[PDB]
Amino acid sequence: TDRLKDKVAIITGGVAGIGLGIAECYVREGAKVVVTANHNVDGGRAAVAKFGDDVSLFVQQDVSKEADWQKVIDATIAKFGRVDILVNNAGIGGVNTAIEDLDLADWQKVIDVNLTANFLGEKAAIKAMKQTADAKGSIINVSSVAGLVGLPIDPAYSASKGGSRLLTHATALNLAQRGIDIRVNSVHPGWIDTSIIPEDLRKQIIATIPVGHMGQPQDIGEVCVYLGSDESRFANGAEFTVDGGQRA
Amino acid sequence: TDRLKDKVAIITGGVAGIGLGIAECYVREGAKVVVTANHNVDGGRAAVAKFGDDVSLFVQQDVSKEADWQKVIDATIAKFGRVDILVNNAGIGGVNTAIEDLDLADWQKVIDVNLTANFLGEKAAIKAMKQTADAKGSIINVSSVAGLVGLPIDPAYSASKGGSRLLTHATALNLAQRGIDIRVNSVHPGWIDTSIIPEDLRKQIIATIPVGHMGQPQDIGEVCVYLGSDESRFANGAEFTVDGGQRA
């Protein structure tokens, strides 16, 4: 049995790191994937060549732009006929700079990409699900437990993650109350082994993970398979943490 | 499939309702199951007849009794050679009344069966896992939405479920700190339709569920497959809520 047979999924930030692991798990389970990225178009070439252009498609996308969402939706439908799943995975990370010295622009950019872009994606995926999937679908909002090492001191990153969490709740409820079978859940990765970091951090990172190591990207992929499939038809407005016990 | 190939699972209260659902999903994925019940001996025979002698075993068990835990471990190792997964699913409602009118004995029964029994089981499962499974395994405490938010009609229940949720955190961390690869996680079902009730009560229950219908036992089963299998190797000390939006 292929757990995502004929499902069509949009995965933002989908050609590198965590998003790529989600794409790999999805393709493995029989799904068609549209993977997107703002700048990494060669990442898109590589993914499509890996998966095959019959089951995968790359689209360039800046998730902060309302216009690129319509562009991805149209490209997804044009290629695959429908939209069943949105994985909002694209996000920018946390920095350790003093809060009183943070420029508005740097704050606003994080809010745009980590929070507002989730809203925009939801809105776009919901319309396309009502239009092509009999108002049925699953939306997954991905946000790391910690996006900076040690204390979550990045006010922008933390704020946008907190925003994303409640967005998920409110959206699942906003839909449910009008009888629309579109589930919205959040996934919360701890520390995944993708980007290399200085050893005075990497060792300091692992020191914060009870199980003594980092996750792989497919760890996050596996939970997304669950949430994307009808195995999770009664999971809604909920938070799914895969963090090696980081915030236990 | 076989997402649980050659895993041996103990499932307490596994012969009816949610527990039977978990057992059905487990058997589907190639697991061997030991299902237990305190009173429902005939439900247990029925389960083994439906699954088969070769992959299932019924052991009568009062989860509150320390000796019954040793009994199930003994029977499990004698039958299947090892213990890979414990699902603490057995539980009891509690006396619906005014808090200050609750008898200590009624309070204590609920604590005994919903909380202390979980600890007894973790302990028994951990020893069996170190001895027969190279100190690898997965423990799932089936708690309740009532361990996340207060249940007005039954505070002993709420208390016991909030306790087993935190027990889950501590146990996972206690194991992880010492390098032991036994994961502990909690599952929080909302309303699952498992019994006949008055239509008045059913309406009241459904009003509290945003999606407007109770879940089914296999909804819980599915998340338990994910948690019991190696797919969730980086999920630890975490809470998995399947409640159709109830506490969103």
Place this chain on the structure above:
Amino acid sequence: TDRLKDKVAIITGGVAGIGLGIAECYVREGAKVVVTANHNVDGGRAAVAKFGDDVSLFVQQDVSKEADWQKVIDATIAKFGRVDILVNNAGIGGVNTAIEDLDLADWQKVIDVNLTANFLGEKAAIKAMKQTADAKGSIINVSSVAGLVGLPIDPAYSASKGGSRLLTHATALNLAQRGIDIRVNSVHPGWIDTSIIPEDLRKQIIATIPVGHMGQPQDIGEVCVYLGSDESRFANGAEFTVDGGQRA
């Protein structure tokens, strides 16, 4: 009395509802209060008139505008020579629409006023405290219950209060890590009786409050007196909920 003796506080949204309640408690306890509004000079005059001219000062303020924070700060130091306390109480609801039909401009306006404004105020206040109070002080982010559980009718409000909440945690830790004695906490009001409202809506709001009645504005002020004074010197990065049991 005199629990806030010789303290100077800026209270945004300070001339009506919750904020006026906070100001009333603050004045009562010996504080100098700079209350602000964006479009309520009439409100700001009655407050100033009733508090006196020497204990209260009114300033027009758009909390979303970075320039107005400077203006308010400057005028507070002009009048009272220091800043000890900031109460981020200004906030707005949004459209009560279906999520897929919410215009980005409506989303953005809620995020600007409820979330980004809080960050702007924090920057402003931290700078003023560093120089005019020996880097000691208290910031109180007035979020809401909507920042703890989802508000179906307003996903942007939920997202923003969820954001305010984590912003609080992050800001408190950012300052503490640098040995700066500026505390940041959030307060989460449930339903407080401010507007006049129709009986039907009243009855159905009161239906969701376990204690059977809305709170008063001074209920929020009492918890803010505590958070503003040195009685709470060890209260940091925490959440303070006064909601008549609404999210219990």
Place this chain on the structure above:
Amino acid sequence: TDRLKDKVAIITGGVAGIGLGIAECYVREGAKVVVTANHNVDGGRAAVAKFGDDVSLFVQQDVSKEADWQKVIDATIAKFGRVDILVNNAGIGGVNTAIEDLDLADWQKVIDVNLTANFLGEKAAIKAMKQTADAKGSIINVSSVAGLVGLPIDPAYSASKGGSRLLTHATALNLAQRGIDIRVNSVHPGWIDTSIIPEDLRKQIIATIPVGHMGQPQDIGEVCVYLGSDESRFANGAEFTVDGGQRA
């Protein structure tokens, strides 16, 4: 102008450390106090002598004992005529024992004292408030953020802390549904400097506190003053954390 004027409060574990801090704040604010202790009878007599026996009383009490609860209630009414506040402060800290090595008797002891005792106290206090204070009162369930220095690894401590959290919510709700104005809330102390400890232990402890220092007993007493008075009449089923940002 005294904030707990004429109030009668029972405070378990109220003769040393944190409990004594709560007692000090309470007497300062005009309350009459009954402080209790299991073994520390000398401390009990000291406290009453310090406060004066016209405003205080000491009763020996094992909070796990149903009968001792009646004893305390009986003595309180005998001496002060009524019961307005209960502070459940008695409690055992945690240990670093391996989960699978923990004896049932050791587990049970902590459950009895840190969870079941809160239930027994709530039960006794509510009856007394109904009978002598017109079904008005305030109940405070105190449980510290950490029971151990490092990771929360003590299963019994964590489980009882989890259960008390939920007992607090459910009890508040159980009462509110019957129109009974007894509020139940929890208070969560961080590390409080109460005893002589070795400097390496102090170092490890402070390492986990973001503000870089322990609190003082009266930090806990101040928040308890707020909760015990009518300043917090709309505060119910809620958790108040005073921890220097320890779990922020």
